[PDB]
Symmetry: C3
Subunit: 189 residues, 3 copies
């Protein structure tokens, strides 16, 4: 099996990366956007079970909670579902301010990689995609915010997830999308 | 020489990577989008000739053919051209479902890296871009699809392409862009 | 210290990478766009001072100057500012043709990573983002162009930037976004 690196108290395999497609740099409050995000096994070790976690982060206010946004997703060709508030970590508060809400977006991928027992194994070069629909409620803004993709994997089958609400005991390479929640640019000319 | 990995029977140099810009996460049937894709030599071995391949994949149906979409491209500062249906691979039907249509988008880049003999050598840190205009015919949809970038290179000068229709005898790191072909998100609010 | 590669006479740590979000593949002359770009320490060596450099490149004309566009940005949670032309490199003219304008987008990041003395250290896994507003004046176009992200860092505390107008004495991994400046695609159908 692969060897992990230490970030905080967690193990991280950089061979499991993630990519965003279609995240806008400015999101209008109240408006619904759809984007896709996918994690890909760039290593050679096939993980027996995998799922995506998504973290919503505002750097310049700490009142954001899970309830302030709507979140739906679909794992590859499986059906759409509403992201489960109980499958989230509790709000986390960096010492410099802000807040982030970690949301689990795991599940079978429609029988592409997923297996009849419910596991989503990740062989080399393979990938799992989440199509995501996201909307923040009106009246909430942020001037420096991000979505973060955090691949969760189970090192070995019988291992169990380490953070309550999120999938996995080891994690992949964090990928970022920075955005603003508010109004788009005035014309510079 | 450079190091290859064996996937299927093919040699793959991961140092030749690809990036997408401007791929939407939802594509409207009948509508034309333009995006860009470029492959970059992140390694140190200079390849004597290179060209881009693009793969369109539907995970949830196997009736897609080259004819069901229109595809134009332009290599860096060269002129626009229509992609050649004869420079495509035949339909492929993965066991994990669907069909994919592999398309060659090769050619001189307008004299940036390209040479008078038509070759596009790829030195370290250098990159080649295809600007791509894509439209699917009205009336065809997909709920989980991808565009894939597959950089093709000729290991040795005068080597011959190994997959009929596609450029290259060895290949780079596959890059994915997941999307849906259909209607956009309804308002969550 | 970390390990560098030599590109021209400059030292490059490929471990400091950059990502774009929201760069359109086609930019309309005169119009203002907002995108975000961020650089991340994918290595283990914490850099004592870092700042983003942004290169605007036209491959097919050499008359582009800094005066031909308007450029505003904000480092993470800090406020917007107009990019300083005196904090740009002189126009550079590749031997194959074209021109590129290297612009410094440095500054405190709003107290996230930045320190009271003004430096923006970059620990492992941490990141700095620029939100960018860009507009080209009407009447200049380009059919093959790019934005390039070049993380600039200070190897040792108190080091001096090496290229005039740009931040850093060593640099990170160049990241590209290819686009056209002109009219969007006509309908292919
Ligand atoms: C991911 C895309 C990649 C990896 C590239 O493709 C970059 C390559 C090729 C470019 O596309 C240029 C045709 C066009 C140049 C595009 C970007 C140009 C620079 C960032 C330019 C300014 C800052 C300096 C960075 C240090 C580290 C090297 C020096 C010389 C200089 C650099 C430059 O002068 C470049 C070059 O002379 C050639 N180069 C440069 O970055
Ligand atoms: Cl990643
Ligand atoms: Cl790649
Ligand atoms: Cl690339
Ligand atoms: Cl990737
Ligand atoms: Cl990079
Ligand atoms: Cl010139
Ligand atoms: Cl054009």
């Amino acid at each position: 099996g692969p060897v992990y690196r230490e970030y905080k108290g967690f193990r991280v395999n950089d061979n499991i990366v993630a990519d965003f497609i279609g995240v806008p740099a400015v999101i209008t409050p109240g408006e619904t956007i759809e984007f896709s995000v996918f994690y890909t096994n760039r290593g050679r070790y096939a993980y027996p079970d995998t799922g995506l976690n998504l973290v919503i982060w505002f750097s310049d206010r700490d009142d954001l909670r899970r309830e302030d946004f709507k979140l739906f997703y679909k794992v590859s060709r499986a059906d759409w579902q509403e992201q489960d508030p109980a499958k989230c970590w509790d709000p986390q508060f960096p010492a410099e301010g802000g807040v982030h809400i970690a949301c689990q977006l795991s599940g079978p991928d429609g029988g592409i990689l997923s297996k009849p027992d419910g596991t989503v194994p990740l062989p080399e070069v393979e990938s799992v995609t989440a199509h995501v629909r996201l909307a923040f409620r009106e009246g909430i803004t942020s001037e420096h915010a991000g979505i973060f993709a955090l691949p969760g994997m189970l090192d070995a089958p019988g291992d169990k997830s380490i953070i309550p609400g999120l999938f996995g005991n080891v994690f992949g390479r964090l990928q970022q999308a920075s955005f603003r929640l508010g109004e788009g640019p005035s014309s510079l000319y």
